[PDB]
Symmetry: C5
Subunit: 206 residues, 5 copies
């Protein structure tokens, strides 16, 4: 307990908080999705509800320490409010995202952070034809709302969404699910913004 | 990180917070809407639900800095709680607005701020006839709740609402969408209040 | 900005906050309602939903200043959390009131405050007969929850509810709407409590 | 204002906050219910919704003062966050309780506190037969969640629930309503725990 | 009041807060469920809603005191925000858990804590066949979201869920309910994570219907 308390005090109580990335100190966030359930479709509003968890990974020099100086501590858990976290946002949500897991991240001695929020999302999706053999395809982009590609870049480790925890008795079966880096431009701003496009093809289970 | 931390400390930790505009130091806020979806209509209550984002821009002398003195930083992202923001309010809402994006603004060295909240709004609108060829027209005014035209003026850069991100598979198609500065008077107060009137004509998609 | 910052610091950062009215220092709050919409009726639960705004006015000696000493500032806007506000409560609500406007008040140099919260209220009301020519009458009392008439008195400037912003395409039309001071007694307490009784007669629009 | 400010500063800013009752310093809380409305019954889930207010009374030596020393102040209103309040909990709720009144208590010079929260509660209740002459009976226990009878005792002043403000046009009429102290054990804990059992018999209004 | 105020000040205002368990100082949390009601089933979304309370118990050396030095105080109630609490999470929830009881724990002089949150949970469960005699079986895992088995272990005192407070007029009757420690692995992480698997068999309360 003593060494960890000392480590946390040194990382968090001495300097001002990390002010986020800049054009001079850009950051790459690795994203990956684990899809748990397509919980419902609303054919009267063209909204669909997903439950998933989103693995986020990034690295900051300001979170580095030498384990020798702190009783061989190589990592620790801490409230996400203690650290900067990326503002990864769904671009076609129709309701605020609901948080289904504790807001706690794991920080490692090399300055790397792992944060894996479980979420329920309602997003824009037309489910007409979901009861057919061909099913339907829907898509939602996830990216920083406020940081361009000059401050936050994104990547995935694989373009295949993890389906190994998908609910076996869901009303919907997944035909395919991919997660792919894209570049986009917006009216507000001349700079490219980066997103990961989650594309899910599904149909009613036989 | 170092120069930005120094800049933020200088802008925010030395003076009291900006106390908002006054008759002596008035402020002009530029508004623009990007309409993403008419998500639903409730013909039993005459309420309609929109998802959009609202670009807000204003300029304060108290947020100016010389980039030379701060490692050539020309802008930065910061929590909207760190700065004053205008109290732009829908005048015919029937529920609290739901926030769909992070509360983070971009501040630029000339003292200009850009803040772009994504919102879901339920407002007063009679959808009778939406299933016809002619469709229906609805309107909602956005403006300061508490500041008259002597403290906050509004403008738009264009009268045309941005429809380039409108959801292509929405239940409703947009026939027209405009955003227009207006002056209004209220029983409480002799002074003019300024709003931007969002006027949307829509119908059920064919 | 400078003079206002100085004024706010002098009013709020020197003394403890105003502790509310007392039997020795009683307060009169002026109330007035502006009815915007009867949004829905639920005939299965006898609940009706109103959207309105409630103009509240009171005066404190502790909020007085001389404009000469503060750059001719005669009024200012400030967060309602900076000041004491009266605990005006609907007596037959069935849900928490939903807040539809920013929590910001206007303070004037004579010590007077104006605070105008927009609200959506569900309250107890039997709508049986609303679809007839005669319509139905409903009523809800607004008053302090915790302060008797010895600490908070209420008045209205007029007994006529302001209907000039009533939604023209509402499902319901207003036949009459009055706001009237009353005295009431409760089992807990021997002292009179004051309320303003909002009485609305309405029917389904032709 | 001056004397009250001084009294509040002396009661609240000098000592640490009251840490709650103990086996050495136990407390008796007096409870009483005022039933306003049975708002709805859900026969598909066996949940019923009540609106009531709950009068709570207790006495602390640490809230005593001599009125002579404080300009003859015999009582005052204060935010419930300034004081300890008992953790009175419904034992068969199905949703979080909704708060319908301001969180403000009245403290009197003898150290007694009166706090009267208005609440909407959904609780477990089978309404089958409510449309008959005999009606149905339902019950819910209210008590401390965490303090045994050695720290918190409860009493009522009467076993009759106050029905004098019951909504006259409710869908349901009340045949009887009682509030009765009970002692229980729970598997977690060896000590007796005290509750007040609210028993309501009702039927659909003729 | 005086001795307790002194005890709380000594436990909470002198050191930094307990930073949670570590591989060097692991912690075992005991869990047990008391099922109060299956409030509803949604056959169109395969979601079911439970109301229960979850007894959590753990022990920290940093919460120990000598009762002799504090007026013979052997335990006290305190806000759960004053102490570290384990991040026990349902693994197949479809909505945020709703809290139905005050967030207050009981701390005892040996450093043991008891915290018993009442909760309403919506979780993934197919109720097809609930209206039959055999009923349906559903399951939900509860465990730390972020701590592996090297930092947080779990146990139960019994594998039988407490059903003695189950609502007698519920729409659903419980046939059986068990709570069992399990080990699981996740894609993110090589380390084992521990959960307690809550398995409930239930059916509609129907006529005065027999269990065969
Ligand atoms: C940490 O690692 C060093 C180097 O191997 C070892 O000698 C020491 O015993 C360890 N210290 C602790 C506190 O585990
Ligand atoms: C700012 O720009 C100048 C060149 O235009 C460069 O020499 C200087 O090093 C820059 N400052 C920093 C901190 O990078
Ligand atoms: C206040 O009003 C007086 C009288 O007109 C004027 O001379 C003075 O300049 C004003 N003060 C400021 C700070 O504008
Ligand atoms: C309090 O009451 C005493 C007794 O009559 C009186 O003499 C004193 O002036 C009072 N003080 C105030 C502030 O009312
Ligand atoms: C504490 O315990 C001792 C031993 O039983 C007893 O004599 C004393 O009165 C107790 N109470 C205190 C210290 O308040
Ligand atoms: C890329 N974002 C999404 C839409 C607007 C844009 C943006 C840019 C800067 C600050 N806020 C929002
Ligand atoms: C312009 N607002 C709209 C209606 C009330 C008015 C207002 C004015 C001052 C303070 N609050 C609200
Ligand atoms: C006037 N209110 C309505 C009924 C209870 C009463 C009251 C009085 C004092 C403190 N809280 C509530
Ligand atoms: C008396 N309560 C009701 C059920 C559990 C119990 C309890 C006791 C101590 C801390 N939390 C809950
Ligand atoms: C065991 N957890 C649940 C799924 C991912 C994993 C995890 C690990 C670290 C931080 N958050 C979540």
């Amino acid at each position: 307990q003593a060494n960890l308390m000392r480590l946390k005090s040194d990382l968090f109580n001495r300097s001002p908080m990390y002010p986020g990335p800049t054009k001079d100190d850009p950051l790459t966030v690795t994203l990956g999705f684990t899809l748990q359930d397509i919980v419902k479709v609303d054919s009267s509003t063209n909204e669909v509800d997903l439950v998933y968890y989103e693995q986020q990974r990034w690295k900051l020099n300001s979170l580095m320490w030498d384990p020798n100086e702190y009783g061989n501590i190589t990592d620790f858990r801490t409230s996400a409010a203690d650290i900067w976290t990326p503002d990864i946002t769904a671009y076609s949500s129709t309701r605020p995202v609901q948080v289904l897991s504790p807001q706690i991240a794991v920080v490692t001695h090399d300055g790397s952070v792992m944060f894996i929020p479980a979420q329920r999302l309602s997003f824009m999706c037309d489910p007409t034809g979901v009861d057919s053999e061909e099913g339907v395809t829907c898509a939602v982009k996830f990216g920083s709302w406020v940081y361009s590609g000059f401050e936050i870049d994104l990547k995935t480790d694989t373009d295949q969404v993890d389906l190994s925890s998908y609910y076996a008795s869901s009303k919907y079966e997944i035909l395919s699910a991919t997660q792919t880096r894209q570049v986009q431009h917006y009216s507000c701003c001349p700079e490219p913004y980066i997103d990961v496009n989650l594309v899910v093809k599904f149909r009613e289970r036989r």
